[PDB]
Amino acid sequence: MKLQVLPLSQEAFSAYGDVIETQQRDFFHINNGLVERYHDLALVEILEQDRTLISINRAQPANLPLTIHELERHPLGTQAFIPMKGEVFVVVVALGDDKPDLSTLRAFITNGEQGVNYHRNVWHHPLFAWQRVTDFLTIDRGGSCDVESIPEQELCFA
Amino acid sequence: MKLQVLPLSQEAFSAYGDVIETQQRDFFHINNGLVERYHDLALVEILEQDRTLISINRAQPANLPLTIHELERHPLGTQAFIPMKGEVFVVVVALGDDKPDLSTLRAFITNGEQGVNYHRNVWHHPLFAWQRVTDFLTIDRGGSCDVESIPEQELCFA
């Protein structure tokens, strides 16, 4: 089953989470104008844990052609990923209350200038780099989530 | 008044906050080993606000030679800064319950591979880039902090 990978945008990703980027986003000038502050880009949410967690996930690149078969979901908290050095990366998402609703499965490749923030219960493929090793700053609950199998998918670019 | 800038390290910065880096830090292997997760790097803390905020601060470079004279502190929450593209940056910190205790004033230059996380009430100079424009991913309360003047300081490298 082929799954076309589309460019990442806030509009197309609205149902799964937030896109962390500055392009076409509102900001406040701070100081003489030395700093531009692009406020509230991602809705962080953590349940059953007063403290949020900041970590660094160093993910290896995946074998090409990419072909996922599993999906995870964190019902207890959101999870953000921001490339450490501005590298491009891929994400696969899907909705569904019980199991992943295949009709809502989507694949997105970033422009190398945007991060991502998965909303609670959103199904997404486990982290993996694209082309070369990559460091991702993570912002989530990360405690102890839900893995589910799906019909093998072969990601395509076109 | 000259102020020598020392290399940033967790040991020397322990009293002001946390250093977000992977070097010599403990991590868990995830998957067959595709991802390495370096858990809890920074103590995020927010008061009088259920939600944490994630934004991007685009700071202009400062005029050389660097010479600060003000210091701010956020009594209500911590504040993290992580360079977007791995660029080096400088930080000035100091403690003190009421006003900045000048005997604890310190300046630090990062190695371009580390972020920083200011603890509550810690005095730090407002954000500014080094050499060239820089994007910083921020993680704080950012509401509406306390600015205080100090004897002019000229930062030096040696």
Side-chain angles (χ1 to χ4, degrees):
Chain A
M1 188 57 68
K2 283 195 189 301
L3 174 67
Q4 304 298 145
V5 170
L6 324 86
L8 183 62
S9 74
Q10 183 60 74
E11 296 177 346
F13 199 65
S14 76
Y16 310 93
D18 316 298
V19 179
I20 302 173
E21 63 180 345
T22 55
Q23 195 196 153
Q24 302 285 308
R25 312 296 270 251
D26 293 354
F27 67 90
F28 307 122
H29 286 84
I30 305 293
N31 294 65
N32 175 60
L34 267 290
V35 178
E36 300 192 3
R37 187 207 171 210
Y38 295 74
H39 66 312
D40 202 299
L41 272 32
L43 278 110
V44 181
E45 180 192 3
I46 315 294
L47 292 297
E48 293 121 300
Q49 186 168 297
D50 161 280
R51 64 308 308 175
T52 309
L53 270 50
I54 303 296
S55 61
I56 292 180
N57 284 75
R58 175 136 69 222
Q60 282 285 102
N63 319 157
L64 311 166
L66 196 289
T67 171
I68 67 164
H69 47 262
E70 58 194 296
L71 238 57
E72 59 163 43
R73 55 116 81 137
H74 306 85
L76 291 193
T78 57
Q79 162 162 282
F81 287 112
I82 307 81
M84 221 75 184
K85 296 183 140 56
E87 44 269 294
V88 167
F89 72 106
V90 187
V91 296
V92 187
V93 287
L95 289 178
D97 285 301
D98 171 18
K99 310 195 206 76
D101 177 316
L102 273 285
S103 80
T104 63
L105 192 87
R106 301 282 183 287
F108 294 104
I109 191 179
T110 75
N111 56 31
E113 263 48 51
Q114 55 203 174
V116 59
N117 173 63
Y118 300 118
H119 281 162
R120 273 177 53 216
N121 285 309
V122 173
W123 296 83
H124 55 271
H125 181 59
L127 230 202
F128 74 86
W130 197 244
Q131 303 285 58
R132 67 269 298 192
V133 193
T134 298
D135 277 9
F136 284 91
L137 178 87
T138 312
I139 298 166
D140 64 5
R141 173 181 188 290
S144 281
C145 266
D146 288 340
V147 293
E148 272 292 13
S149 167
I150 57 167
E152 211 190 14
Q153 223 78 166
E154 175 197 352
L155 282 63
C156 294
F157 302 81
Chain B
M1 191 107 265
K2 291 199 177 302
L3 173 61
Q4 305 290 48
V5 187
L6 328 95
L8 178 64
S9 58
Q10 256 291 51
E11 242 182 5
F13 195 74
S14 60
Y16 310 99
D18 312 299
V19 186
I20 291 67
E21 60 177 348
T22 61
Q23 186 153 169
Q24 313 302 168
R25 305 295 265 259
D26 294 358
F27 65 86
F28 311 127
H29 291 79
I30 304 302
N31 284 185
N32 199 52
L34 294 324
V35 183
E36 299 185 348
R37 168 167 188 268
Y38 302 79
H39 52 292
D40 191 80
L41 268 43
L43 298 70
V44 178
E45 192 186 18
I46 302 302
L47 311 194
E48 311 181 15
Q49 183 166 300
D50 185 352
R51 68 297 314 166
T52 309
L53 265 67
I54 305 311
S55 76
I56 289 174
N57 276 87
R58 178 133 72 210
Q60 288 306 113
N63 279 194
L64 283 167
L66 225 312
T67 171
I68 65 176
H69 59 285
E70 63 280 67
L71 241 44
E72 71 177 17
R73 80 117 105 75
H74 306 64
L76 284 181
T78 61
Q79 189 161 193
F81 287 106
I82 312 80
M84 215 65 176
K85 269 63 177 171
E87 47 266 285
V88 165
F89 76 103
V90 189
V91 292
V92 183
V93 287
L95 296 171
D97 327 274
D98 261 50
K99 309 284 194 58
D101 175 354
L102 294 322
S103 70
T104 61
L105 186 69
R106 291 285 186 300
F108 294 103
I109 184 169
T110 56
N111 52 34
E113 196 73 305
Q114 53 199 185
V116 110
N117 179 64
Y118 301 121
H119 284 159
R120 282 181 48 235
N121 288 305
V122 175
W123 300 91
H124 59 274
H125 181 81
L127 222 204
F128 73 86
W130 181 241
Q131 312 289 44
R132 65 177 67 185
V133 173
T134 297
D135 280 1
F136 287 95
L137 193 100
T138 325
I139 295 169
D140 58 4
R141 180 181 187 297
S144 48
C145 284
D146 293 348
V147 298
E148 287 296 284
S149 184
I150 59 171
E152 184 187 358
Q153 220 76 26
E154 179 183 354
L155 274 67
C156 287
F157 304 86

